[PDB]
Amino acid sequence: AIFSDRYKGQRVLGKGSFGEVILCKDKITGQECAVKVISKRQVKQKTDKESLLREVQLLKQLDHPNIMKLYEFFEDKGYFYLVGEVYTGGELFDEIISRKRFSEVDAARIIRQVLSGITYMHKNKIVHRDLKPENLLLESKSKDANIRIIDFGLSTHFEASKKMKDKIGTAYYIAPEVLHGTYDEKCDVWSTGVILYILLSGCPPFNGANEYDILKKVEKGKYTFELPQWKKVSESAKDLIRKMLTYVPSMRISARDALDHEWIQTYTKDVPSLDNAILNIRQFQGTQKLAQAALLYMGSKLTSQDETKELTAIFHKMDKNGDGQLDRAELIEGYKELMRMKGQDASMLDASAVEHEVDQVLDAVDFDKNGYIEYSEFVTVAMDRKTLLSRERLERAFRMFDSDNSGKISSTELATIFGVSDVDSETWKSVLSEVDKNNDGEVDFDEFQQMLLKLCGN
């Protein structure tokens, strides 16, 4: 069975752990699904084929309201196609920051759902290991929507990326025992404890100016509740967090036992709003998403340098007599040749999607698609479109982060952003000196963009 014989791509949702995720549709039944596409060249398997196939077969039979439903699995020479149920509510934290109030009742209802999901998967001997806020999706845009946990089962069968653009926001949530090599299902309880701590305070329990500093704190395992906003929080919530953030996993509370904890029993069956927490989460989230967007922008610029020259070289080879003109079918053949090697665009997984993409570029530049075309102009527009989309994505993240609409990001804020982005301190300061030549101690959007261009060799 071939994935593209059955499914057509609608639109790219985004890059998640291990691969890009595409909204797809069954060509016969019209069923919509969310397909995670793992490139075999970029991601290495940890287990054999026997093991992976059996896991998939088990997962397809499992069913729980707080776990993503898996429908199908496909494999070809280059990729794995993981076909799951599509959820439309987005990431939990993105919904949380938009609401006016947030209490321990809201938090307890959220955590009960997470613990219920984890409990169920643990009964079936499946461990997540990489549990974090971006793995908590809302089933729909409804106010009361269930949480659906994504990526259960993946870490067991695939090695994680070492690229920082993939490792953003991982260090806060990882259990200490995962760092040293001996771990079991209890690591998921630790990660949920970290998430709970953040839900109630808006600040990570283990924090630092860069990834390795965060990991050092995690490894020591020590945290406190001495921040002012913990005065608002019930002792039972702090007691549960303690039990989930117990260092020795054998002494740490199980997921199933946490469901029976006083705090869950009291607050899920009077309570003020955690206003300081929601403000801190908004800053946390904003900071995290801008760091991610920065890395993705820089990644997109490098992909463009690579793809522009490769696409030009492919068409040069095709252009036999060398007059620079190729027809639409040839442009498709060359663009296929390109996306064939590169694992960048997952929405270009079959010939039909490539035909469509080529037509969109020709329609943008007002070139007639039924005659011969100046390929060098096609390349420029095809790449400039991606450059523009990348620029616009970054800008939206910049505006989101700039919550007072000042138009600026301060040096203190840059340190925070670049710290999360794990860009070396003297490196970004060096680039800031290049861009900020009046010692303003702040950058507008274009200046920020220029700093990022200088941080990826431009």
CB-based contact 43:19 (threshold 8 Å): yes
Scanning residues 72 to 101, which ones bind ligand V68 (CB under 6 A)? Answer: 82, 84-87
B/e letters for 262-288, b = 16+ CB within 10 Å, e = fewer, are ebbeebeeeeeebebbbebbbbbbbbb
Structural tokens at position 32? 């919509």
**Contact by Cβ (8 Å): 94, 285:** yes
Residue 107 is classified by DSSP as H
- The smaller minimum CB distance to ligand V68, of residues 147 and 154, is found at 154
Closest CA to 21 of 92, 103, 110, 81: 81
Residue closest to 167 by CA, chosen among 62, 299, 321: 299
- CA-to-CA distance for 307 and 312, rounded, in angstroms? 8
Q: Is 323 annotated as a binding residue?
A: yes
- Distance between CA atoms of 138 and 365, rounded to whole angstroms? 39
- For residue 156, give the 3-state DSSP assignment: helix
243 in contact with ligand V68 (CB under 6 A): no
**Tokens 């949480």, located at residue:** 147
Q: Would you tell me how many other CB atoms lie within 10 Å of the CB of residue 431?
A: 19
Question: Among 14-22, 297-305, 327-335, 362-370, which window interacts with ligand V68 (CB under 6 A)?
Answer: 14-22
Stretch that binds ligand V68, among 10-18, 183-191, 209-217, 251-259 (CB under 6 A): 10-18
Asked whether residue 184 is marked as a ligand-binding residue, the answer is: no
Residues between 296 and 355 with contacts to ligand V68, criterion CB under 6 A: none
- Asked if 16 touches ligand V68 (CB under 6 A), the answer is yes
Which residue in the set 6, 7, 24, 34 belongs to the binding site for ligand V68 (CB under 6 A)?
34
Residues 331/358, Cβ–Cβ less than 8 Å:
yes
How far apart are CB 33 and ligand V68 at their closest, in Å? 8
Position among 36, 112, 122, 328 found at the interface with ligand V68 (CB under 6 A) = 36
Report in angstroms how near the CB of residue 149 gets to ligand V68 at its nearest.
Answer: 9
Nearer to ligand V68, 67 or 215 (CB): 67
Q: By CB under 6 A, name the one of 70, 114, 281, 414 that touches ligand V68.
A: 70
d(CA 233, CA 225): 10
Does 177 appear as a known binding residue?
no
Helical segments of 319-409, H only: 328-341, 351-364, 375-401
- Residue of 154, 264, 451, 455 that binds ligand V68 (CB under 6 A): 154
287: which 2 tokens?
């900071």
* 345 labelled catalytic: no
Q: How far is the CB of 15 from ligand V68 (least distance, A)?
A: 6
Question: Residues with Cβ < 8 Å from 244, sequence gap 6 or more?
Answer: 189, 190, 192, 193, 196, 252, 253, 258
| 150 binding ligand V68? (CB under 6 A) | yes
What residue ranges in 255-366 does DSSP mark as E strands? 325-327
If the CB atoms of residues 78 and 208 are measured against ligand V68, the closer one turns out to be: 78
Does 68 interact with ligand V68 (rule: CB under 6 A)? yes
Closest to ligand V68 by CB, 90 or 221: 90
Q: How far is the CB of 18 from ligand V68 (least distance, A)?
A: 8
Residue of 130, 151, 166, 345 with catalytic role: 130
Among 22, 37, 43, 59, the residue binding ligand V68 under the rule CB under 6 A is 59
Select 73 or 428, whichever has its Cβ closest to ligand V68: 73
As annotated, the active-site residues are 130
Binding residue numbers for ATP: 36
Q: Which residues bind ligand V68 (CB under 6 A)?
A: 13-16, 21, 34, 36, 56, 59, 68, 70, 82, 84-87, 137, 150-151, 153-154
Binding residue numbers for Ca(2+): 319, 321, 323, 325, 330, 366, 368, 370, 372, 374, 377, 402, 404, 406, 408, 413, 436, 438, 440, 442, 447
